[PDB]
Amino acid sequence: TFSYTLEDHTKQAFGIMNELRLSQQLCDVTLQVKYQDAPAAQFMAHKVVLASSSPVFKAMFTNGLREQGMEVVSIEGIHPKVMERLIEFAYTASISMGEKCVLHVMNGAVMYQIDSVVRACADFLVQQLD
């Protein structure tokens, strides 16, 4: 019985999924994000990728017999630049922010139950303490 693992596979595959997001290929969800006075922004993505990084997106998208193709979802209580970074995190495993924003990001991550960014931003904030 021959067996093989490519330990770099998930990383390569995500690199391509993020390219597909950036060229807007295969996308099946458009996140329309309106936050108070921010201009509206919209982000296209793949449901299965969002679902695999956030229990909130997974529950959002897993509903028996559902839409065919492009669902537009309205997103309210989060700033576009925060949603942007959570999407990136989901597609890349990485997130960056101006130390001013660590808190708004932690807020976004809590709402989408992105566990690992929640720790990340809590440890930062706490480290930032005397």
Ligand SMILES: C=C1C(=O)O[C@H]2C[C@@H](C)[C@@H]3[C@@H](OC(C)=O)C[C@H](O)[C@@]3(C)[C@@H](OC(C)=O)[C@H]12
């Ligand atoms: C870095 C950005 C981010 O990731 O989310 C933005 C949050 C948004 C509410 C922010 C607003 O904050 C105030 C004081 O109204 C004004 C501010 O211009 C803002 C749009 C961005 O800048 C910072 C440092 O907070 C934030």
